[PDB]
Amino acid sequence: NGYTYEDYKNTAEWLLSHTKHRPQVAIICGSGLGGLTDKLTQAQIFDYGEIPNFPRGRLVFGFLNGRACVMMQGRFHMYEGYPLWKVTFPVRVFHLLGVDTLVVTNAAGGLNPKFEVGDIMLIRDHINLPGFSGQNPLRGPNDERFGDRFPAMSDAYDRTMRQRALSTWKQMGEQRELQEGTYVMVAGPSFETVAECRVLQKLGADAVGMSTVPEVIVARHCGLRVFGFSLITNKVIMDYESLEKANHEEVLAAGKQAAQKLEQFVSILMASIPLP
Amino acid sequence: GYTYEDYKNTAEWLLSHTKHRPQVAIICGSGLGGLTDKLTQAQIFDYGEIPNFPGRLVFGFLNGRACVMMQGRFHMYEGYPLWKVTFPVRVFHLLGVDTLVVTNAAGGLNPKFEVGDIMLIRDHINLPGFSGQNPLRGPNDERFGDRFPAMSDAYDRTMRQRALSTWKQMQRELQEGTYVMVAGPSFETVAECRVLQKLGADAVGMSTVPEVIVARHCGLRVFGFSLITNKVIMDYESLEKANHEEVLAAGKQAAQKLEQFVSILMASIPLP
Amino acid sequence: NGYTYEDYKNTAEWLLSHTKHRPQVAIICGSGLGGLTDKLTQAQIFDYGEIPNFPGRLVFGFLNGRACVMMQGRFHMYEGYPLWKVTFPVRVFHLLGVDTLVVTNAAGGLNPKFEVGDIMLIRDHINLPGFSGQNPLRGPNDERFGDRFPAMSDAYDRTMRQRALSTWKQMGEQRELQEGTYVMVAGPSFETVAECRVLQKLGADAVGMSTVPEVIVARHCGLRVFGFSLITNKVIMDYESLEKANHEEVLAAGKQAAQKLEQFVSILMASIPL
Ligand SMILES: O=c1[nH]cnc2c(Sc3ccccc3OCP(=O)(O)O)c[nH]c12
Ligand SMILES: O=c1[nH]cnc2c(Sc3ccccc3OCP(=O)(O)O)c[nH]c12
Ligand SMILES: O=c1[nH]cnc2c(Sc3ccccc3OCP(=O)(O)O)c[nH]c12
């Protein structure tokens, strides 16, 4: 909405002049991935504040397991009051840098009763509840330099990468298996009532969270390959008996507990991404 | 952003610039590009020449019925507020129109639907409406209608019956069901398609519901239909994807059929 | 959000300087509660127009001896108010020292067991505007009000619903107190048959156009919440019917229930924790 094509190009040109790094892969770090940047070789850090036209967090360029990457440490959320054209601005910039693959991670509440806290859910699909009612990051004039006016989302989550994620996990010899299912985005920031949890379950959602879907829609619009996963930080309360309530402290704690596992998994998975 | 006087000024400008007095407004969806080509005594106004208009408005006779056709409609996905999207409907009321015919393209959710099927809209599901994107949001003007209008009778029962009889007197049956509006402009995921099916929607599209709500608010009779341009993808196996090119192509293929159907249907609209 | 913390504080300080009344309970009067203020002792009236930063009247006094402030007239999303205007009074109530919110409304019946005139205790809600971004907490969080990510699963105080059921029983009323899930939709137009079938399948017992925003802001600031719906009409759920939902029937059901609702709320004040 408030960005011109030239604004995206200006940001891209600034980054390309300020780093020799040329990323193939953008990684939008969700809950548990705070310290993924700590595994980079030839790390180069830009605070969002230094970068022209960035919403008012760090961008880190380097090699993860020898793959050229740019990592978003801190992401923008609808609940913070950012319009979706600010939330998704970095994805357009990543395209103009030459990125062809987006890895997106988040925290989610478990709606699938088979899910346990600490489970990693590969995102096979999403339900965009804000999108239905008008909150789609593509709303407004389309620029054909980014992509088509009416892009398909039915193939948003790369089938090959989900297969390679399953095989990678198996070779790490981890105690618990990978989950796979549907992420529903809600705006938040307040957690769901029992009645709302039952709604999202009946809609066929496996996990609920407050991000990711906008970035994926913009990535697919630009032609990026997309892979995503949720850390299941908590089981959403689905009955009136329970005196447990969802809280941010338990989300942070589950993230901290999973951090080493998630970092290792993403690092190893870089080897499985197709070459440019 | 419009005052009552803005609507009135637009209506007065049109009434002074044409001798035509339409009874029927037709909002042309996918496939109806060339419906204006069937008008007698055709008179064209580019949106740009019309005061307060956010494309062309064409006045004339379709099968001898006094009509005004919207060629080009405004969509939520284009970034228009719903008070711009639905502005023409208020104007139509002030011109003396008593009937709105609304057409669109839609994706098939009902597995019985085939590409090229015409679905009479019996009802709608307003997903943007639930969350606040209702064109009536804001102060109500009683000169247009009631603060809290009913929508349960939005799609005129008589016109749906006469549409079925007209169709019979023209290879495939006329479908009938529920249209769900989503904002778009991206097409639905498989999971989203399963949601709209479980909500009981037969067809999905990206328009129409706003105009219908404003039309019913103003007391217009409403008739609508969808051209089923594509079957929405409902399983992960398929390598088929929804695309705008297929929507345009289905529209072009159905155009002669849709134009003939609407033209003949004019004869079935009640007199004022 | 167009209000700063200092704006809420300025409004609260103005009211605290202009009345000696110190309410424990805020009552947001829905359909049928027009005349509840007429039962207050030591009543003191402020027109919204007089009150700094207010987007109707605020009445302070004692209801059955309980210190209360009553909103007569509430702001609705369908009027064009942003939710940060709709819910502004709730923040003010917190700063006045209110610890309990009583919220009332009119609703359409989705549950086929419900009859017109039934009172439904709200056990839970479904926030349809909230899912899509219309949450009154959207924007920067102020920790002086509450947490960035508050839970809503315990929004409707269990104890007050138990005491409401026992209070009802002691009034010896013809019909039982209903209980269930309120779904907020923005309106202002009434639902289609297909939309009524959606809300039923989502598990909603009753539909209306308010309340959920106020509750979310109340819970964010740590208020105890009790709420109920007057069932003004049974929503049309089949194509055969020539009945339509209309505002006149909503007003008429409100008028018919008014004496019953006023008595119920008055008696219930005695059951609120100190
Ligand atoms: O139960 C749940 N309901 C709804 N959302 C959630 C989330 S996500 C979440 C919650 C609080 C703060 C931040 C969060 O995510 C940030 P991000 O990873 O998308 O960057 C966990 N649990 C539930
Ligand atoms: O599968 C589908 N999902 C969601 N919407 C659709 C539409 S409508 C449509 C699609 C692309 C561009 C424009 C469109 O409509 C314009 P209008 O007819 O309302 O003026 C067809 N098929 C699907
Ligand atoms: O069938 C119904 N559908 C949807 N909403 C309703 C309501 S609430 C309502 C209706 C018309 C006008 C105002 C109303 O609310 C005022 P408040 O009590 O929230 O302040 C009753 N019946 C139905």
Numbering used by the authors:
A (entry chain A): 3 to 58, 66 to 285
B (entry chain C): 4 to 57, 66 to 181, 184 to 285
C (entry chain B): 3 to 57, 66 to 284
Authors' description from the paper:
Purine nucleoside phosphorylases (PNPs, EC 2.4.2.1) are cytosolic enzymes involved in the purine salvage pathway metabolism in most organisms.
Purine moiety forms three direct hydrogen bonds with the Glu201 sidechain, two bonds with sidechain Asn243, and two-waters-mediated hydrogen bonds with the main chain of Ile246. Phosphonate moiety of compounds mimics the position of the phosphate ion in ImmH cocrystal structures and the position of the purine moiety is also conserved. The estimated Ki values for the selected hPNP inhibitor of the series, compound 18c, and for the reference inhibitor (forodesine) were 12 and 33 nM, respectively.
